[PDB]
Structure 1
């Protein structure tokens, strides 16, 4: 029920191991970052609407801070997420390699020699 908590050589509260730096960072126009910025913009607009201020005009410094905070946090969130998926794939490939008797390569047939069952539609 806890697959990656017990992995060896894992620092308790890093959020970003040093090994993560071997991975390409997300581009600054990453559509997920753009969506995080859009979330910040919606937060700014709802903020204006709740306090009965003009919705698109009232606080531009405030809306800018909303957008910037969301983009800033989202960048690091994306880094950590991509790093965790890289760990998953690394471990899966290493395990398949070290246990070849569990992942055998069997000879595959062309469809000319596989007998498939035919079911007429009528």
Structure 2
């Protein structure tokens, strides 16, 4: 779908047109879940390595957390930019092809005859 999109330069995680969108907030629920994933990784690291799972290596658990949040922020930016691109192309295509997307003639339920099915 999006592979051969025009202007799509290779090996570029965020293109420069993404800087027009709002960056994700720092307390973004998805970013906080990223940090939680890092914290779980640190706890499981203590468990497998046979260390006290909660209080051993606070620097290591902390680094797990911050690296997970660091990757999550950029992942969120790229995801949001891809969805913005999707909506951008969809609206452009609906605009360029009005015949494929007609203006449906709206009618009220007072003139629309819906069939009644009794429950009995």
Q: TM-score, normalised by structure 1?
A: 0.97
Kindly state the Cα deviation for residue 106 of structure 1 after the two structures are TM-superposed.
2.3
Q: Distance in 1 between matches of 2:75 and 2:104?
A: 41
Hey, what does 1:10 align to over in structure 2?
A: 8
Q: Distance in 2 between matches of 1:106 and 1:31?
A: 38
Instruction: Tell me the secondary structure at the aligned position of residue 71 of structure 1.
Output: helix
Kindly state the Cα deviation for residue 51 of structure 1 after the two structures are TM-superposed.
1.1
Q: Distance in 2 between matches of 1:82 and 1:27?
A: 12
Q: Distance in 2 between matches of 1:75 and 1:113?
A: 52
Q: Distance in 1 between matches of 2:58 and 2:105?
A: 65
Kindly state the Cα deviation for residue 30 of structure 1 after the two structures are TM-superposed.
0.1
Kindly state the Cα deviation for residue 107 of structure 1 after the two structures are TM-superposed.
1.4
Extract unaligned runs of 5+ from structure 2: none
- Deviation string 1:51-99 (CA, Å, 9 cap, x unpaired) is 1111100100000100000000000000000000000000000000000
Kindly state the Cα deviation for residue 11 of structure 1 after the two structures are TM-superposed.
0.5
Instruction: Count residues in correspondence.
Output: 120
Q: Distance in 2 between matches of 1:6 and 1:27?
A: 31
Instruction: Tell me the secondary structure at the aligned position of residue 109 of structure 1.
Output: coil
Q: Distance in 2 between matches of 1:109 and 1:97?
A: 24
Q: Over aligned residues, Cα RMSD in angstroms?
A: 0.5
Q: Distance in 2 between matches of 1:51 and 1:93?
A: 52
Structure ranking higher on relative contact order (CA contacts 8 Å, 6+ apart) = 2
- Deviation string 1:12-49 (CA, Å, 9 cap, x unpaired) is 11110000000000000000000000000000000001
Q: Distance in 1 between matches of 2:8 and 2:49?
A: 45
